[PDB]
Amino acid sequence: TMVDQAVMDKLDAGFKKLQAANECHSLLKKHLTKDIYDQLKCKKTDMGATLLDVVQSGMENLDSGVGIYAPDAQAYKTFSALFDPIIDDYHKGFKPTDKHPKTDFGDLNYFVNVDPKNEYVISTRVRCGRSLQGYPFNPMLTEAQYKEMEDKVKAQLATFDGELKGTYYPLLGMDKATQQKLIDDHFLFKEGDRFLQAANACRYWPVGRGIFHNDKKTFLMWVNEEDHLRIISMQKGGDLKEVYGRLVKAVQHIEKKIPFSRDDRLGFLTFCPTNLGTTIRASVHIKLPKLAADRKKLEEVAARYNLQVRGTGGVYDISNKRRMGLTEFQAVKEMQDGILELIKIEKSL
Secondary structure, three states: OOOOHHHHHHHHHHHHHHHHOOOOOOHHHHHOOHHHHHHHOOOEOOOOOEHHHHHHHHHHOOOOOOOOOOOOOOHHHHOHHHHHHHHHHHOOOOOOOOOOOOOOOOOHHHOOEOOOOOOOEEEEEEEEEEOEOOOOOOOOOOHHHHHHHHHHHHHHHOOOOOOOOEEEEEOOOOOHHHHHHHHHOOOOOOOOOHHHHHOOOOOOOOOOOEEEEEOOOOEEEEEOOOOOEEEEEEEEOOEHHHHHHHHHHHHHHHHHHOOEOEEOOOEEOOOOHHHOEOOOEEEEEEEOHHHHOOHHHHHHHHHHOOEEEEEOOOEEEEEEOOOOOOOHHHHHHHHHHHHHHHHHHHHHO
C-alpha cells in the first residue's frame, strides 16, 4: 500500500496533465484510463517502487512513444493493469493471458554462413539484454547497488575463455584517448537523453557503468546502460552460426554465476517493456542492388519472415521485428531463413 500522499499528489498532477494534453499520443496516455489510474495509484512493489516510478517519464515527456518504464522486475505484476495493455499494443497482440515460451537457444547447428562467398552480407550481429536477479532496474538503483553489481559482472567477464576474453573499461576514470577509440569503434555509450533522465535512469553516473569487448572485437557488452547487461556478438560477413554461437556461449558463462530475471509470462524482464521476451535482435547489413530497385518486393519478402528493412546503392539493415511469443531459436531462425531467401531472390534478378 503506497501511503505517501505527496507522491499521490504528484501522480494526480501528472494524470491531469496527461488528460489535458490533446496533442499527446503516447501509449501511456492511451492506456492509463481513470479506472486503471485509480486501481494502481496506491500500489507499491517490495523494492519500494510506486506508480510514479513507472509513469513519470511519460508525464514529463508528452512526446513519448510508450511513456512508461519498469522500475524493478515486480512492477510488471504490481502494475500489470497498465503494463499488460501497453505490452499488447506495442508488441501487436500479446494478450494478458498470453504466455511467452520457455527459453530455448535451440540447435546451434541449424545455423549457417548465409553468404559463404561474401557476395551480399557486409556484417552480421545478434544482441540480447538481461536483468540480474535481486536488483531493481535503473529507476530505483542506488550508487552502492550499481557498484556492487558491476563488481559481480566484472569478475565473470575476467574468467571468459579464449574466444571471449578481453578488456573491461569502466566509464569512471576513462581517459580521452580511450574514449575516442571506443567512439571510433561505435562501442561507447554516454548519459541518456531527456526520456531516460526523467525516468531517473541515469542516476549516480558513471558509477557501475562500463564497456567490455573481446580481444578481436567480435563481442561487446554494456554494463548498466539501459539494462543491467546488453550483450552483442558481431562480425564482418554472413557467418550467423559463429555470431549466434558466440552470443550463446557468453550468456551461458555469465549465467553460471549470475542469475537473470526471467518471468514465466513475459520472458526476460527489462527496463523498457519494448525489450521483453527473447530480448533478441538479429540483424545483417546487406547489399542487394537489384532488390533495391523493387522495394515493394523486398518489403513483401521481408514481411513473410517478420523482418524489418531500413535503408543506410541498395544497402540495408534487415532485422527481426518479433520479441514476444517465440523462442530465441525461432527468432534467429526466421532471420536466417529470410536472409537466405532474399539472397536467392537477388541472385535470380
